[PDB]
């Protein structure tokens with residue numbers, strides 16, 4: 001349930017936002033269109049809709065399935 005450092009190395013199966021939203025899959029362009037695809041970042045573990053941090057943010061995050069909300073941090077603690 002926890003990520004180390006900045007979450008850059010996190011490769012867990014959590015997929016829920018802090019708000020309790022569900023993560024959009026990185027390969028998906030819906031509802032939010034973006035460029036952080038497993039296609040463009042083949043080495044950042046952009047697998048299914050798992051919380052990740054391909055941009056060196058401060059914790060694992062994801063795009064959200066809430067059309068209203070583009071992205072949020074995931075509901076995780078820092079180890």
Ligand SMILES: NCCCCCC(=O)O
Nearest residue numbers: 034035036055057061071
């Ligand atoms: N760390 C969250 C980033 C928000 C924008 C991501 C993107 O639009 O590629």
